[PDB]
Structures are given as structure tokens and as C-alpha cells.
Design a protein around this ligand. Structure first.
Ligand SMILES: Nc1ncnc2c1ncn2[C@@H]1O[C@H](COP(=O)(O)OP(=O)(O)NP(=O)(O)O)[C@@H](O)[C@H]1O
Ligand SMILES: Nc1ncnc2c1ncn2[C@@H]1O[C@H](COP(=O)(O)OP(=O)(O)NP(=O)(O)O)[C@@H](O)[C@H]1O
Ligand SMILES: O=C(Cc1ccc(C2CC2)c(F)c1)N1CCN(c2ccc(Cl)nn2)CC1
Ligand SMILES: O=C(Cc1ccc(C2CC2)c(F)c1)N1CCN(c2ccc(Cl)nn2)CC1
Ligand SMILES: [Mg+2]
Ligand SMILES: [Mg+2]
Lengths: 352, 352
């Protein structure tokens, strides 16, 4: 049977598949056609149906897992299209995590003799993240940060070493946000969460601008000016608020200029997309900073798919965490951002 | 000259006026007509122009201030209409605070010989709050909370004593949010702030629903169902998330159901007004709780005008702080919610 791990989130299903590359002559003969056509279908296509995507650039090659050499593949599709996935499956031990492992448990069991083992979101995320960093990204660092995030002429992606990764604050930006404090391989807790996450950005953006995809929303935001919608410290004070070290450019009230009808009439959809992105991102950064301070942790790693192909938000998080913490905290990012739960699920396979 | 204190915020100007009631026979004769017509105009009207309002129910009567007995009056109008206020003034020592004391400094000096003394927002808020609580609300408690905020059949406003008020976490919800830690009468700090405040509610509401006033926005929200826009824990898990004590009713992603076109098409403006209010209010509550935990303070007082005639948000804050803190924190409220900076300004008058 094929080796999958699946993280069924509120928005996206993430799938990790291990493709063995040490298939012997005897093993190839003694393999069932449906197993052969699964591997063929998955490795010969990068789009699956109309909404499935293989993130080819993330592939881990020549990985030794469970005593086999193979390639680790990373695949995603909308949770909305899980019925299509299950129907295809009805035309195997499945380790699954995320809320959808519970919600859609009965649906997966419509696949005859399929064994569904549910694993907790937290153990899977932590196990997957530590594993991927431990095997490296094909010899390159899995973890990176933005050096000199204060000056834009100097700001550049640089690798970051996590050989001793503890303690770690993990900020998981999915539909919502979960915040975890990791003190060791077996000692971690969910510190808190916020409901202002990726689904808020996408939902509000679609309401305000009519955008029809995550990528279109980011493309509108790259052309916008959030200060058209937001009220800044200088709009209230006429400059800096010296007494409390608030610069004139800080946002005092997100969307706060939209209380005036004349401003609502002149703002562009691109401006509103950017103000939505900036509002959500800054609020995540601030919550992350308060949790780091309370947990006494200075390394904050951001994961989840809100940050995929989203350099605006990454740079904003890098700059804001460094500025508002007076350099006490480092914003850290990971190449395999959205897939750690799916990997951790796959890694629970020996337990069954 | 009349005794005013003024807090010019980003959205509202708040004015406290002390009306002496011990005016002797000689003092009344030796008073200039313009001084007489000011007092007459202010005490004989409750609407001023088309946007000024005297909050008559807040009046403090027979207060002894600066060695005179008088009544303390509380008046508000939009910062947008401050030019009208200044023009009326051109047809006095002014203690002023808030950002607008700096921004509009030069405008106030167009009033001949008027002396403008700017006072810091923080000192004024703390001084005003402690003063009003110390003199009481005409013999009644200035401070109150919602008893048994968990059960709605029992939930009722009850008075709360602040005779020793320290330490105190003050959460000032204006256009944005400022959070203060008060350890004594002369020892207080701004802990942090958030830009998701009252102006966010009003700005987003106006964009999403077309509402044209704060009160209309609250009226739409009272008729709405935020779960039409928000994605709940049970939408993702199918129930509670037992492992982390997240109830199925908690919001997992604010506006997170609005990523689906069919849901955007069926949601009502009232639903979106309520989701806006709930999103902003819960985020303020969560930030307040994290700051309380980090400052080791268990009493959290909420002020500012986001909460005036807004019992939905007060009850939401009362219930959420008690629930998520497992009863460790008390949400506290004050009758003179939006006016403490204006009172504190007035109290700086002897210094000049
Ligand atoms: N193709 C995409 N479609 C939808 N959302 C996307 C896409 N790419 C990135 N995103 C963003 O990524 C978020 C989902 O991230 P993800 O980490 O996969 O959450 P999730 O696991 O589905 N939700 P959760 O149950 O809270 O853990 C969305 O809210 C978007 O902001
Ligand atoms: N009549 C009203 N008009 C406008 N906003 C109102 C009104 N009544 C209540 N509000 C709410 O109260 C908020 C303003 O509160 P307030 O404490 O007066 O802020 P502010 O001092 O003007 N702003 P700031 O500079 O950040 O301190 C608005 O954002 C609304 O949510
Ligand atoms: O964690 C969350 C939200 C959440 C839930 C679930 C998930 C994903 C599916 C697993 C998330 F990403 C996010 N909340 C707990 C803390 N909250 C508050 C609110 C008020 C106060 Cl006063 N304090 N805290 C807000 C709710
Ligand atoms: O206080 C504020 C906002 C603010 C300013 C001014 C006023 C009123 C006029 C006086 C407010 F009500 C609110 N901010 C500091 C903390 N912020 C962050 C952001 C990212 C990170 Cl990572 N950390 N912190 C956000 C900005
Ligand atoms: Mg997820
Ligand atoms: Mg104010």
C-alpha cells in the first residue's frame, strides 16, 4: 500500500506521499496494477483534476524513510473537493490529522477496508517540523529569516540553523491562528490562538474587492496603498507620538479612515486588499510578540499557508517583530510552510 | 473664564465643563456678558449645533472642585466639526489632551489671547479615572461588572469597589486601542496597543453594510447572526476540539465562511455587522487577557467610546474574559467611559 500522510484543514487538504525509488525487480513484478497506476498518476502529473497541485519545488529526493530510499512529495487541494478525492479512491492505512480527520472520518470509511488512524494536529505539526529541519531541504537550510529587516536596501533572505531548536514559538497561520510553545521533543503546549487568520484575509478581501482567489487577492494587495484606508498615528497627532515611541507611520486604527464617506468613495479595491493584508499580518505579529514575551521565547517560527507565495506578509512580519521588540525577537520562516502536519501524520505510520 | 477640559481624539472631541452653582450676588454682577451667555448656552441646551451633544445623565452635581461647588458636565462632538467649534470661539486657559491637542494647536491659537496647555493622554486618563471613581457617580458606584457573566439567565450589572485600585489594567478602546498598566497614582505605563479598535468596527461596517452612523451599525449588529460569516470550531472539527479545550462554538476563523461565493451571496448586512462587532470585540478581549497575564494583573477596566450604548460588546467582553481566563480575570466597566481624559485635563488647571 502507498505511504501517505494527510492534514485535512478547514480550507486546504495537504498530502505527503513517499515514492520508493529502490524498487527491486521482484518487488515490481509482485505489485498490483492499481498500486502501479497510483504511483504513475501521482508522479506523472503536477495538476490533479482541476484543483489538485503538486508543489514540485518542495520535493525531498533520496530520503531514507522507514528503511527505504525514496522521494517525499507534497500535494494540496481544497477541502471543498475532498468528496472528489474520496470518490476517486472508491474507483491502505491512512494516517490523517487536522479537524477534517474527525469531521470526515465516516466518509473515509466508505473506502472498503481502508484503516483511518486519526492523529492530533499538535503532535503532527511538531513532529513534522522537527523532522524536515533535521533531514534538511536537499542539503539546504529548511529555516530562514530576513537579515537586516529594518533597512530595505539590505533586507535579504538568509538561512537559519535550528540544530538545537528549543525553545520554539510556532505560529500556525491557517484559516485561523494557533500558537504553540515547544520546549522539547515531547514537551509542547498550545499557548493560545486567534481567529484573525488566513480565512479572515481571504473572506474580507472577497467581500471588499470581489477577488476570486488567494493569489488574485495578493496581486491586488501588491498594487495597493493601505494608508488610504488606515488611520495613522500622524493623522491623529500630526506627527510622531514621542512620549510613547510611536512613529507617525504606525497604524493607529485599521480601516479607520473608512468612517468618512468621501474616503470610502475614493479608495480603490487594491488599497482595501492591502489594508486587509496589513491589518491581519500586524495583528498576528503583535499576538506572536506578546506570547513570546510571556513564554520567554525569542525565536518565533511562522508556518501555515497564509504565507505561501506571500512575501509581503513575510517581510511585514520580519520587520514588525524586529522593530516592535527592539530587536529582542527573530521572525523565522520554513520552506515547507504548509505541510508539516501532513509529514507528521506520515511519520506515525509505524505505530500501526 | 470658564473651566473646561478637552480631549481631542482621532474621532470624537470630549469636553468637560464645570458650572459653578455658588455664584454670589457680587460675582454675578461683576461677570462679563460673554461669560454669562456661554454658561447660559451650555446649560440651556442639550444639542449644540447639529453634531454636539451633552450627556445629561452623566452630570456630576454639587461637586466641590478647586474650592467651588458646581456641576460637572460632559459634552461630545465629532473631531471633524472642530473648525465649527473654533469659529464659534472666535465670535480663557484651555487644558487639552489627546492627539488633537498637538495637531490642532495652531488652530486654537487663532483665538486671541487664549492659552493652550497640552497635557499627555496617559496622565490625563489615569488622573481623570481615579478622580471620578473617588468622588463617586452622585453617590453610586462609578465602576461595575457583569455578575455571573457565564449564565445569561443570571447575568446582571453589579457595582464594583475600587477604593484601592492598584494594580489596574486599563484598556482604552477609541479609534484604536491603548493598554495601560497602572501600579500607583504616579507609576503607570503604556503596555502596548492594537490598531483593531472602534474605528475598525465603524470603518469596516460602513464598507460592508453601508451603515451611516455608529448607532445604526450597532442596531444592524443586534439583528445579525455572526455565525453566518464566521467559521466555527465545529465547522472544522464537526464538534469540540477536546484535546485543547476549544468548544465547538468558538470562532476558528473570523469571516472565514466568506471565502465561499455561495455564502457571500446569502449573508445579510446585519450578519456582517454582527461579525464585525464580534471579531473586533473578541480580539480586544484576547489582547487584554494576554497583557493581564504578562503584567500579573487580574482587574481589567475597559474605557473609551467604542463601548457607549454598546451592551453587546460589554457582555461579550464580560463573558469572554471570564471564560477564557478560567475565571482568573474580571472585566470591569465605568459609567463615564469616554470622558476620563477630558476630566484629567480639567484637573491640570491649577498648574497654570
Ligand atoms: N490556493 C489557496 N486556496 C485557499 N487559501 C489559500 C491558498 N493558498 C494559500 N491560502 C491561504 O492559506 C490559508 C489556509 O492555510 P492552511 O495552513 O492550509 O489552513 P488550514 O489547515 O486549511 N485551516 P486550519 O483548520 O485552521 O488548520 C487560507 O486561509 C489562505 O489565506
Ligand atoms: N457618535 C459617535 N460617532 C462616532 N464614533 C462613535 C460614536 N459613539 C461611539 N463611537 C465609537 O467610539 C469610537 C471613538 O471612541 P473615542 O474613545 O472617543 O476615541 P478617540 O479619542 O476619538 N480616538 P483616539 O485618538 O484613538 O483616542 C469610534 O471609533 C466608534 O466606534
Ligand atoms: O484559539 C482560538 C481561535 C482558534 C480556534 C481554533 C483554531 C484552529 C482549528 C484549530 C484556530 F486557528 C483559532 N481562541 C481561543 C482564544 N480566544 C479568546 C477570545 C477572547 C478572549 Cl478574552 N480570550 N481568548 C479566541 C478563540
Ligand atoms: O499601539 C499601537 C497601535 C496604536 C497606536 C496609537 C493609538 C492611539 C492614538 C493613541 C492606538 F490606539 C493604537 N501599535 C503598537 C503595537 N503594534 C505592533 C505591531 C506589530 C508587532 Cl510584531 N507588534 N506590535 C501595533 C501598533
Ligand atoms: Mg491547518
Ligand atoms: Mg481617545
Amino acid at each position: 500500500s502507498p505511504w501517505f500522510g494527510m492534514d485535512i484543514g478547514g480550507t486546504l487538504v495537504k498530502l505527503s506521499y513517499f515514492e520508493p525509488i529502490d524498487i527491486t525487480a521482484e518487488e515490481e513484478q509482485e505489485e498490483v496494477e492499481s498500486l502501479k497506476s497510483i504511483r504513475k498518476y501521482l508522479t506523472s502529473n503536477v495538476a490533479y483534476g482541476s484543483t489538485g497541485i503538486r508543489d514540485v519545488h518542495l520535493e525531498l529526493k533520496d530520503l531514507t524513510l522507514f528503511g527505504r530510499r525514496g522521494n517525499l512529495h507534497f500535494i494540496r487541494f481544497p477541502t471543498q473537493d475532498l468528496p472528489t478525492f474520496i470518490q476517486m479512491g472508491r474507483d491502505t492505512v491512512l494516517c490523517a490529522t487536522g479537524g477534517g480527520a474527525y469531521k470526515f472520518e465516516k466518509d473515509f470509511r466508505t473506502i472498503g477496508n481502508l484503516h483511518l488512524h486519526k492523529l492530533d494536529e499538535l503532535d503532527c505539526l511538531v513532529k513534522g517540523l522537527l523532522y524536515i529541519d533535521s533531514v534538511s531541504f536537499n542539503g539546504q537550510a529548511e529555516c530562514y529569516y530576513f537579515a537586516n529587516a529594518s533597512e530595505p536596501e539590505r533586507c535579504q533572505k538568509m538561512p537559519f540553523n535550528l540544530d538545537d531548536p528549543y525553545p520554539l514559538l510556532v505560529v500556525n497561520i491557517g484559516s485561523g491562528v494557533s500558537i504553540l510553545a515547544v520546549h522539547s521533543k515531547d514537551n509542547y503546549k498550545r499557548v493560545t490562538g486567534t481567529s484573525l487568520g488566513g480565512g479572515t484575509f481571504l473572506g474580507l478581501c472577497s467581500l471588499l474587492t470581489g477577488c476570486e482567489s488567494f493569489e488574485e487577492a495578493l496581486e491586488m494587495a501588491s498594487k495597493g496603498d493601505s494608508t488610504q484606508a488606515d488611520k495613522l498615528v500622524r493623522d491623529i497627532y500630526g506627527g510622531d507620538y514621542e512620549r510613547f515611541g510611536l512613529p507617525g507611520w504606525a497604524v493607529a486604527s485599521s480601516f479607520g479612515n473608512m468612517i468618512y464617506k468621501e474616503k470610502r468613495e475614493s479608495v480603490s479595491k487594491e488599497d482595501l486588499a492591502r489594508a486587509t493584508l496589513v491589518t491581519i499580518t500586524n495583528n498576528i505579529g503583535s499576538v506572536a510578540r506578546m506570547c513570546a514575551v510571556n513564554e520567554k521565547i525569542n525565536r518565533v517560527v511562522f508556518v501555515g499557508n497564509f504565507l505561501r507565495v506571500n512575501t509581503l506578509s513575510m517581510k511585514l512580519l520580519a520587520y514588525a517583530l524586529d522593530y516592535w521588540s527592539k530587536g529582542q525577537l527573530k521572525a523565522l520562516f520554513l520552506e515547507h510552510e504548509g505541510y508539516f502536519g501532513a509529514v507528521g501524520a506520515l511519520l506515525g505510520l509505524p505505530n500501526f
